[PDB]
Structures are given as structure tokens and as C-alpha cells.
Scaffold this active site. Structure first.
Site, PDB file in Angstrom:
ATOM      1  CB  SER A   1       0.185  -4.854   8.913  1.00 43.61           C
ATOM      2  OG  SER A   1      -0.396  -3.658   9.389  1.00 43.61           O
TER       3      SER A   1
HETATM    4  C1  LIG Z   1       0.460  -2.407   9.238  1.00 40.28           C
HETATM    5  O1  LIG Z   1       1.521  -2.386   9.711  1.00 40.28           O
HETATM    6  C2  LIG Z   1      -0.576  -1.108   9.342  1.00 40.28           C
HETATM    7  C3  LIG Z   1      -1.392  -0.944   8.274  1.00 40.28           C
HETATM    8  N1  LIG Z   1      -0.279  -0.650   6.868  1.00 40.28           N
HETATM    9  C4  LIG Z   1       0.662   0.168   6.815  1.00 40.28           C
HETATM   10  C5  LIG Z   1       1.409  -0.217   5.633  1.00 40.28           C
HETATM   11  C6  LIG Z   1       1.394   0.249   4.441  1.00 40.28           C
HETATM   12  O2  LIG Z   1       0.254   0.549   4.098  1.00 40.28           O
HETATM   13  N2  LIG Z   1       2.249  -0.059   3.495  1.00 40.28           N
HETATM   14  C7  LIG Z   1       2.064   0.021   1.887  1.00 40.28           C
HETATM   15  C8  LIG Z   1       2.289   1.504   1.575  1.00 40.28           C
HETATM   16  N3  LIG Z   1       2.235   1.504   0.088  1.00 40.28           N
HETATM   17  C9  LIG Z   1       1.038   1.651  -0.642  1.00 40.28           C
HETATM   18  O3  LIG Z   1      -0.010   2.024  -0.185  1.00 40.28           O
HETATM   19  C10 LIG Z   1       1.522   1.383  -2.030  1.00 40.28           C
HETATM   20  C11 LIG Z   1       0.638   1.488  -3.191  1.00 40.28           C
HETATM   21  C12 LIG Z   1       1.259   1.464  -4.336  1.00 40.28           C
HETATM   22  O4  LIG Z   1       0.596   1.471  -5.545  1.00 40.28           O
HETATM   23  C13 LIG Z   1       2.641   0.881  -4.512  1.00 40.28           C
HETATM   24  O5  LIG Z   1       3.034   0.713  -5.883  1.00 40.28           O
HETATM   25  C14 LIG Z   1       3.451   0.712  -3.259  1.00 40.28           C
HETATM   26  C15 LIG Z   1       2.792   1.173  -2.178  1.00 40.28           C
HETATM   27  C16 LIG Z   1       3.378   1.211  -0.869  1.00 40.28           C
HETATM   28  O6  LIG Z   1       4.479   0.491  -0.386  1.00 40.28           O
HETATM   29  C17 LIG Z   1       1.577  -1.458   5.944  1.00 40.28           C
HETATM   30  C18 LIG Z   1       2.615  -2.539   5.712  1.00 40.28           C
HETATM   31  O7  LIG Z   1       2.253  -3.677   5.317  1.00 40.28           O
HETATM   32  O8  LIG Z   1       3.798  -2.260   5.462  1.00 40.28           O
HETATM   33  N4  LIG Z   1       0.671  -1.817   6.545  1.00 40.28           N
HETATM   34  N5  LIG Z   1       0.297  -0.072   9.919  1.00 40.28           N
HETATM   35  C19 LIG Z   1      -0.529   0.660  10.901  1.00 40.28           C
HETATM   36  O9  LIG Z   1      -1.608   0.851  10.849  1.00 40.28           O
HETATM   37  C20 LIG Z   1       0.353   1.751  11.593  1.00 40.28           C
HETATM   38  N6  LIG Z   1       0.934   2.726  11.031  1.00 40.28           N
HETATM   39  O10 LIG Z   1       0.433   2.932   9.949  1.00 40.28           O
HETATM   40  C21 LIG Z   1       1.127   3.906   9.117  1.00 40.28           C
HETATM   41  C22 LIG Z   1       0.712   3.995   7.764  1.00 40.28           C
HETATM   42  C23 LIG Z   1       2.741   3.542   9.064  1.00 40.28           C
HETATM   43  C24 LIG Z   1       1.061   5.652   9.704  1.00 40.28           C
HETATM   44  O11 LIG Z   1       1.817   6.237   9.572  1.00 40.28           O
HETATM   45  O12 LIG Z   1       0.012   5.529  10.454  1.00 40.28           O
HETATM   46  C25 LIG Z   1       0.610   1.282  12.945  1.00 40.28           C
HETATM   47  N7  LIG Z   1       1.343   2.004  13.906  1.00 40.28           N
HETATM   48  C26 LIG Z   1       1.569   1.551  14.981  1.00 40.28           C
HETATM   49  N8  LIG Z   1       2.108   2.361  16.056  1.00 40.28           N
HETATM   50  S1  LIG Z   1       1.161  -0.015  15.190  1.00 40.28           S
HETATM   51  C27 LIG Z   1       0.416   0.062  13.481  1.00 40.28           C
HETATM   52 CL1  LIG Z   1      -0.324  -1.327  12.896  1.00 40.28          CL
END
Ligand SMILES: *C(=O)[C@H](CN1CC(C(=O)NCCN2C(=O)c3cc(O)c(O)cc3C2=O)=C(C(=O)O)N1)NC(=O)/C(=N\OC(C)(C)C(=O)O)c1nc(N)sc1Cl
Length: 473
Positions: A215
């Protein structure tokens, strides 16, 4: 031949990082040694060798006019041997490197092999400049771009974060967005290059390890959206119900309590659904072009042998699933150096200044890779990502307006935690990337694990560089 004194490596302010140290090499003419056998035992004992194995060696070389006895004695040890006054024993002044900052800048500086030739990092990359010419002309001084003060801070904070997170490995890169200089480059695990005696610990992961940026590439997808003429920040995307089906593939958001999100909200909530729908509207071609132009999966031109290029997927006709996954950084491979360079271009109002590991006095012309107006709009969005209610508050840098983006990748449950950003937002000076590999405590999201390391390193870096605090009345 007379080995030459290898050039001094300094940091950008002249602090010594690699210094040629005098050592004594002993060689012998066996023909002459064979006339003084009664001296051999005290010569063996002086070299810490078994009397019998030493004696075997000389006897097995009785008709060679030259052999090495030992290399790389201190002058004091070499003096003790010379004071035995053994017939047929001679000495040569050689050089061994000393690394005064040790483990702190080992991956950037590198080290030299047995023969005082570069084997890794800058020692390898600049070997011809540093080496000079064996008799004998001395090698030349090299001032790196690295600031040892920022490097010490980055090293300490990345170490502490690995231990607090029980992580396997990590990288941190700081860049000057105005000059293209690498001001800090640190990795864990590290090694002491003054005492080599793990291959794993010697890997400059920031330059030779590739990873999916996830992301952290969304700001580049958004740059393409804003440059297409079809999107403004206040435009809305319906991301309900937090998932979207494309044939066999399902795009998923972690937080699925959204319907209408403006472009900034897509970044704050890291909505893969929202960025995918924008990607479908503008086409993957526009996004690919931005990512290629900022240097993701492209040659850095740094010329570190073993440096990885990674890979940016490309198509003539983009299928829909590949269009979505490109826009949220899935199935890309980049280095921490590439990601930091891309963030530096965004921070430098869309102008990419070529990367340098050496101190830059005359800054080369930058290439406009994103329009200054789009770059400035994306900066303001990344400032809201950090500062806005529901944002990545652990990236906030007290005193300053900071900007950036989290990422979290699931490896193939093992994670990589990413944060990339820059500060200060009202005239950016520094871009930084924090990559933590396999954090092992409850938190693994980039916003939890990497964002606080960014905050602490950026707080110190801006103050070490005397950047005036920009969060004013
Ligand atoms: C980015 O890297 C993408 C999409 N997302 C995953 C992720 C993220 O969603 N982090 C935020 C998590 N989070 C909440 O939703 C939330 C809600 C509230 O109310 C509070 O208070 C706090 C939180 C909180 O921390 C990110 C980011 O920005 O860090 N971005 N990643 C992917 O799509 C991939 N994997 O996704 C995950 C979710 C990790 C998975 O397990 O599938 C991905 N994997 C690869 N190999 S490449 C990518 Cl892209």
C-alpha cells in the site's frame, strides 16, 4: 610489489569510516631458513604454530626461494619476530582496514578481502578510486553522502524496534529530497566488520533484498488518478461492502465499515477496493507509467554489484485483476532504496534528483516525473493520512507537519511492516522508508510497527539538520 595505502572513507562531514592500518607480513626464503633449523622452534612459537607443523612446512618448500609465513600481524608482533633475527625471514608493510563506527555503518561502507580489495558496499563499488596502484600511488579520499549522526540515530531506533517487535530483519533509508543523497542506510541484523569470524548479517538488505511494497505505492496510483483529469481529491468512491469480486480474485479491505470515501479517505482507511475502482477508471497504463518514472523496479544507477532491480509487472492489455493488484502494490518487487527514491521525487514537488551514495557539492538537474501541481496535491493528502482523525497518528512528528503512507504485506501467517514518508510537509527536506520483516508481537500493521520508528527517526533527523519546526500558529 609494494601494497598502496587505500583511500580514506569519511562521512559527509569528514568523520572517518574506513582507515588503512599498517600491518607486518613475514615471508621467508626456505633455502636460507634451512641453514638455521635451530631457530625454527622459537620462530614457530612466535607465530603461535606447532613446532612440528611449522618444521614440516619449511621442509616441504626447501627449494622455493619465497613463501609467506603469516600476513596481517600488528607491527608489535612483527617486531617480536624480527627481534629473533632468524636468517631468511623478511618483512613487508601491508594495510588492513579499520572501521571506526563498526556495526553502525557496516552495510554501507562494506569491507576488504585478505588482499585489501573491496568485497562489499562502498569498498567494492569504489574499489578503483580507493585502491590506487601497487608499486606505488595512494588511493583517493571518498566522502560519502551518509551523515554519521543520522546513521547512529537510524541504527539505534531500527535495533530497538526489531527487539520490541521480535522481528527477523529490518531496513531504514533516509534521503535528502533536494540533493538525491543517501543520508542514512541501516539494516538489521548487522555485523562488526573489524571482527569477521554470518553471511545473513552481511546482507545490505536496503539494496539487495526485494519485497512487495504493498500500500506504500497507493500515492503513485493516486498521482496517476489526479493527472488523468478524471479525479479530484473531493471525488467519492463507493467501496461498500469492503470487498470486490474480479472473476476468481476477491479484492478485500481490512476495515469494511465504509461506503462513500473521498480520495484522502481511501488512503486513510487503506481501501484496496477504493484504489482498485479508481485504477479501473484511469487504466493500469497510467499507473505503470508513474511507477516506472519514479524508479520502482528500475535500475538506481548506483552500481553496487549485487544490487537488485526488482520487477514492475507490464502488459499490452492489462487484465482487471492485474490492474487492481498493481494499484495496491501486490506482485511488485522493489528495494527500500527504490521506494525511498520514489518518495523523495513526490516530496521534491515531483522532481527526481539522481541517487548518490557520495557527498553532492553540485546537485545534478532533476527530471520532472510527476507534475508539480499533482505532487503538491498528493503531499497534502499524505499529510492528512498522518494528521487526520482516524489517520496513522503514530507517524506524527511533534513540532512538524509530516506526511506518508503505511503498508502491510502478507508473505508467501508472516508479515512485512512498511512506512514511507517525508517531512516537513510545508517544504520537505527528508524522505524515509522503514521496513520491518516478520514482526512477532500482536501488532504487525505498518501503522503500528513501522510508523513509530519513522516518527522517532524523523524527530531526531530534522533536529540534527537544524530544520526549523513548521507546526506554527
Ligand atoms: C497495503 O499494504 C494493502 C492494504 N492494507 C493492509 C493494511 C491495513 O489495512 N492496515 C490497517 C489495519 N487497521 C484497521 O483497519 C484499523 C481500524 C481501526 O478502527 C483502527 O483504530 C486501527 C486500524 C488498523 O490498524 C495496510 C496498511 O496501510 O498498513 N494496507 N495490503 C495488502 O493488501 C496485502 N496484504 O493485506 C493484509 C491485510 C496484510 C493481508 O493479510 O492480506 C498485501 N500482501 C502482499 N503480499 S502485497 C499486499 Cl498489498
Amino acid at each position: 610489489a609494494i601494497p598502496a595505502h587505500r583511500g580514506l572513507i569519511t562521512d559527509r562531514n569528514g568523520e572517518p569510516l574506513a582507515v588503512s592500518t599498517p600491518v607486518t607480513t613475514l615471508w621467508a626464503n626456505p633455502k636460507e631458513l634451512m641453514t638455521a633449523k635451530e631457530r625454527w622452534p622459537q620462530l614457530a612459537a612466535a607465530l603461535g604454530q606447532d613446532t612440528k607443523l611449522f618444521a614440516d612446512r619449511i621442509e616441504q618448500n626447501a627449494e622455493r626461494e619465497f613463501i609467506y609465513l603469516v600476513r596481517g600481524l600488528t607491527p608489535e608482533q612483527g617486531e617480536g619476530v624480527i627481534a629473533l633475527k632468524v636468517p631468511g625471514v623478511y618483512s613487508i608493510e601491508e594495510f588492513r582496514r579499520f572501521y571506526p563506527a563498526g556495526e553502525v555503518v557496516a552495510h554501507a561502507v562494506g569491507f576488504t578481502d585478505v588482499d585489501d580489495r573491496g568485497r562489499e558496499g562502498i569498498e567494492l563499488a569504489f574499489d578503483e578510486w580507493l585502491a590506487g596502484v601497487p608499486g606505488a600511488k595512494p588511493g583517493k579520499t571518498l566522502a560519502l553522502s551518509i551523515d554519521l549522526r543520522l546513521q547512529y540515530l537510524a541504527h539505534r531506533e531500527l535495533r530497538n524496534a526489531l527487539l520490541e517487535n521480535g522481528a527477523k530483519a529490518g531496513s531504514l533509508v533516509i534521503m535528502d529530497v533536494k540533493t538525491g543523497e543517501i543520508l542514512a542506510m541501516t539494516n538489521q541484523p548487522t555485523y562488526n566488520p573489524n571482527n569477521r569470524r554470518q553471511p545473513a548479517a552481511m546482507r545490505n538488505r536496503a539494496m539487495i533484498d526485494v519485497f512487495e511494497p504493498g500500500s506504500t505505492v497507493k500515492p503513485f496510483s493516486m498521482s496517476a488518478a489526479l493527472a488523468s483529469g478524471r479525479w479530484k481529491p473531493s471525488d467519492i468512491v463507493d467501496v461498500y461492502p469492503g470487498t470486490l469480486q474480479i472473476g476468481r480474485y476477491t479484492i478485500r479491505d481490512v476495515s469494511r465499515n465504509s461506503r462513500q470515501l473521498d480520495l484522502t479517505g481511501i488512503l486513510i482507511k487503506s481501501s484496496n477496493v477504493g484504489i482498485s475502482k479508481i485504477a479501473f477508471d484511469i487504466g493500469a497504463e497510467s499507473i505503470y507509467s508513474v511507477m516506472q518514472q519514479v524508479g520502482l523496479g528500475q535500475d538506481t544507477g548506483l552500481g553496487f554489484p549485487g544490487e537488485r532491480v526488482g520487477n514492475l509487472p507490464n502488459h499490452r492489455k492489462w487484465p482487471k485483476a492485474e490492474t487492481a493488484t498493481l494499484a495496491y502494490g501486490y506482485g511488485l518487487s522493489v528495494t527500500a532504496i527504490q521506494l525511498a527514491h520514489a518518495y523523495a521525487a513526490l516530496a521534491n514537488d515531483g522532481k527526481s534528483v539522481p541517487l548518490s551514495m557520495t557527498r553532492v557539492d553540485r546537485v545534478p538537474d532533476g527530471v520532472q516525473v510527476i507534475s508539480p501541481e499533482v505532487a503538491s496535491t498528493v503531499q497534502g493528502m499524505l499529510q492528512q493520512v498522518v494528521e487526520a482523525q482516524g489517520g496513522v497518528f503514530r507517524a506524527q512528528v511533534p513540532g512538524y507537519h509530516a506526511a506518508g503512507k503505511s503498508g502491510t504485506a502478507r508473505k508467501v501467517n508472516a508479515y512485512r511492516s512498511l512506512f514511507a514518508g517525508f517531512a516537513p510537509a510545508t517544504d520537505p527536506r527528508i524522505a524515509m522508508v522503514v521496513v520491518i520483516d516478520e514482526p512477532s508481537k500482536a501488532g504487525y500493521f505498518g501503522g503500528l510497527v513501522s510508523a513509530p520508528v519513522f516518527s522517532k527517526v524523523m524527530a531526531g533527523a530534522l533536529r540534527l539538520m537544524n530544520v526549523p519546526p513548521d507546526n506554527l500558529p
